[PDB]
Amino acid sequence: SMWELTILHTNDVHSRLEQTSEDSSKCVDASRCMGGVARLFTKVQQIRRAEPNVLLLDAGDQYQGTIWFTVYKGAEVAHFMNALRYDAMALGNHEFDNGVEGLIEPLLKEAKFPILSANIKAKGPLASQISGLYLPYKVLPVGDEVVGIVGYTSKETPFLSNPGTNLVFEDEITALQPEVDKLKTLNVNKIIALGHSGFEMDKLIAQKVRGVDVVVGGHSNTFLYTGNPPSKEVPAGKYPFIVTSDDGRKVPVVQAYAFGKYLGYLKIEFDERGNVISSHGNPILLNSSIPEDPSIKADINKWRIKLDDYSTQELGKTIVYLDGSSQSCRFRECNMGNLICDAMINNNLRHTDEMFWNHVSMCILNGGGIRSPIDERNDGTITWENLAAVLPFGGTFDLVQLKGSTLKKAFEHSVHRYGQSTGEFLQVGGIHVVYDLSRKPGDRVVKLDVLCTKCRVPSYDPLKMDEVYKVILPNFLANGGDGFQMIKDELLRHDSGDQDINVVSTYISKMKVIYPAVEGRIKFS
Numbered sequence: 230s231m232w233e234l235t236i237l238h239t240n241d242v243h244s245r246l247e248q249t250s251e252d253s254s255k256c257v258d259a260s261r262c263m264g265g266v267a268r269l270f271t272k273v274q275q276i277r278r279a280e281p282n283v284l285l286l287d288a289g290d291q292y293q294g295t296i297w298f299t300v301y302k303g304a305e306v307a308h309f310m311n312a313l314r315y316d317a318m319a320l321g322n323h324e325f326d327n328g329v330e331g332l333i334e335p336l337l338k339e340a341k342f343p344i345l346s347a348n349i350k351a352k353g354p355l356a357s358q359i360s361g362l363y364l365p366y367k368v369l370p371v372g373d374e375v376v377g378i379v380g381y382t383s384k385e386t387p388f389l390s391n392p393g394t395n396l397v398f399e400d401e402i403t404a405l406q407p408e409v410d411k412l413k414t415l416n417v418n419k420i421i422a423l424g425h426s427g428f429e430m431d432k433l434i435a436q437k438v439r440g441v442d443v444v445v446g447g448h449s450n451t452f453l454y455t456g457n458p459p460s461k462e463v464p465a466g467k468y469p470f471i472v473t474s475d476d477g478r479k480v481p482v483v484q485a486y487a488f489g490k491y492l493g494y495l496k497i498e499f500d501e502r503g504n505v506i507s508s509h510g511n512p513i514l515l516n517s518s519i520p521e522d523p524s525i526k527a528d529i530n531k532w533r534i535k536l537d538d539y540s541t542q543e544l545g546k547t548i549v550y551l552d553g554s555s556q557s558c559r560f561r562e563c564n565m566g567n568l569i570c571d572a573m574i575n576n577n578l579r580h581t582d583e584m585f586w587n588h589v590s591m592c593i594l595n596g597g598g599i600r601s602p603i604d605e606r607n608d609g610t611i612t613w614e615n616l617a618a619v620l621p622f623g624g625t626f627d628l629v630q631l632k633g634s635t636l637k638k639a640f641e642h643s644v645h646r647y648g649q650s651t652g653e654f655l656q657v658g659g660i661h662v663v664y665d666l667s668r669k670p671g672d673r674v675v676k677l678d679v680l681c682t683k684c685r686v687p688s689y690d691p692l693k694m695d696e697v698y699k700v701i702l703p704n705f706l707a708n709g710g711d712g713f714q715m716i717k718d719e720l721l722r723h724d725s726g727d728q729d730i731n732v733v734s735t736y737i738s739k740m741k742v743i744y745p746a747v748e749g750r751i752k753f754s
């Protein structure tokens with residue numbers, strides 16, 4: 230006999246509860262808007278009504294991304310994931326943004342579906358407090374069968390969030406294998422690994438973890454597609470991505486990009502012993518052709534009311550596209566990057582009573598901290614909401630005194646694994662950097678000119694290794710985030726500065742009309 234399972238899946242929704250523009254920014258032209266829970270619901274229901282055996286799965290990073298999360302703090306996530314009748318979720322690295330308390334009380338206690346992570350181990354007083362609220366696996370009934378779903382979360386989570394020192398993030402493969410074996414001994418022949426580690430780790434899992442039939446991932450924002458893709462996202466491989474396992478089997482790996490723009494859709498065809506005979510599908514583009522469900526939309530609008538406080542007051546206006554996309558800001562100079570740094574610099578110079586930092590002209594900004602673009606087409610209005618999506622962490626723009634040799638080392642770190650859309654890539658201000666990627670990591674920086682401080686007229690002179698420089702940057706980087714160990718360890722002074730979003734709102738309010746360009750601050754050769 231045969232048994233067909235349809236896996237529906239989302240990942241990295243990032244609090245895009247409402248429908249959004251093509252590029253994930255705030256929705257304005259509703260006729261061309263995409264995604265959102267209301268639209269998703271409609272599509273999920275069409276599938277549920279057509280297919281008898283269906284599972285709806287999330288692979289983490291529902292938390293953090295828009296004012297939805299700033300205001301409702303995870304309660305919106307639980308509430309609307311419950312309304313969509315999610316079958317399971319894997320804990321993501323952003324689910325630990327508001328601490329463990331901020332995971333437990335809004336989400337884990339209010340979610341009506343199992344929330345999973347096998348490689349997160351609770352220790353000390355936390356263990357008994359959190360016992361049962363998340364699980365390593367869940368065995369779900371699906372018709373006359375059962376499907377084991379085993380959870381995992383990125384080992385990078387303690388460096389990217391706030392899980393605390395009571396949670397230990399074990400290696401995924403080590404953590405998973407006993408759980409998958411345990412399931413086998415419980416006569417569970419169909420096993421899905423749902424987790425939040427990235428496409429590369431998902432592939433390793435499929436290869437290395439005996440017993441796993443399917444891997445449904447997230448974290449890396451990977452778009453997979455079989456055929457001609459329906460939008461601007463460039464596929465990284467076929468959907469499903471077939472990994473050939475060490476134990477001689479074809480294991481489908483899947484992911485569904487990000488921002489609720491696509492619903493992932495995989496039909497698995499199983500035998501009576503839970504082996505994958507075949508699988509096919511593609512991620513479904515959630516566009517205007519799919520109507521928003523009326524009930525969910527009405528419910529969204531009810532919850533929306535509280536949020537409209539953050540959209541009312543126009544801070545200012547842009548007359549250019551503010552390119553805060555991952556694809557620009559992690560790979561090259563992006564004008565949103567330049568806007569944010571110029572604001573960091575400018576706002577700091579307002580504090581004239583402070584003697585030490587009032588000629589600071591140099592800025593570095595982790596591109597991965599830039600989380601949304603802003604559109605210029607509705608008279609390019611900029612509200613607080615628009616700004617919250619760009620900078621959703623709520624950190625500070627701190628001030629550091631760094632040696633020249635430290636900065637060279639940071640800019641070397643900035644491109645040490647270039648090509649993988651990682652967040653360490655540095656947007657800059659008062660700095661003209663030139664990379665040669667043909668060279669090896671640790672020696673990719675061929676030119677690094679910075680603005681002189683001890684000079685009457687500021688010009689760009691070469692960074693000297695033994696000179697000392699004053700730089701403005703996010704506290705995340707100052708605290709040694711994004712693997713910038715050299716900053717934390719080699720900084721000479723570190724002063725806590727102003728709140729990130731306030732700095733950029735204050736700047737925009739001051740300027741009225743903004744038009745940041747790409748000027749050749751970061752060049753390649």
Ligand SMILES: O=P(O)(O)COC[C@H]1O[C@@H](n2ncc3c(NCc4ccccc4Cl)nc(Cl)nc32)[C@H](O)[C@@H]1O
Pocket residue numbers: 290322323326388389390391448449450595596597598622624651652653703705710711
């Ligand atoms: O998003 P994901 O697809 O799950 C993985 O993205 C990874 C990238 O995001 C950036 N990042 N990560 C974290 C991060 C932070 N504070 C994290 C943080 C620290 C303490 C408390 C709460 C939080 Cl929330 N602050 C900035 Cl200003 N930037 C950041 C990096 O650039 C990295 O490479």
Ligand SMILES: *[C@@H]1O[C@H](CO)[C@@H](O)[C@H](O)[C@H]1NC(C)=O
Pocket residue numbers: 459514516517518
């Ligand atoms: C929605 O996506 C489908 C499938 O890619 C496409 O054929 C259709 O034109 C799209 N409709 C829009 C953008 O209105």
Ligand SMILES: [Ca+2]
Pocket residue numbers: 418419420440441442502503504505
């Ligand atoms: Ca099996």
Ligand SMILES: [Zn+2]
Pocket residue numbers: 241243290323448
């Ligand atoms: Zn994410």
Ligand SMILES: [Zn+2]
Pocket residue numbers: 290321322323425447448449
């Ligand atoms: Zn993530």
